[PDB]
Amino acid sequence: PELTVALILGIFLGTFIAFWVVYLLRRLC
Amino acid sequence: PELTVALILGIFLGTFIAFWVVYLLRRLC
Ligand SMILES: CCCCCCCC/C=C/CCCCCCCC(=O)OC[C@@H](O)CO
Numbered sequence A, B: 001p002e003l004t005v006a007l008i009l010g011i012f013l014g015t016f017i018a019f020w021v022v023y024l025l026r027r028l029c
Helices: A002-028 B002-028
Strands: none
Touching: A002 B002
């Protein structure tokens, strides 16, 4: 199903972006 | 369009799961 793979890809991206943002906070700020 | 919403929904859901993983790994480890 296309709606499920779209959600799973978002969940993976959302989890990565959250850790990526904190990484930017520790290194840039 | 429904795929974009499902993607964005997963992204914001992923940001919650990231802090949920840190919570469980603090308890587990
Ligand atoms: C087409 C239907 C698709 C259904 C998909 C359902 C996915 C359900 C998602 C489950 C993940 C729930 C994550 C829930 C995360 C809640 C926030 C949390 O745990 O914060 C931790 C802090 O309080 C620690 O101090």
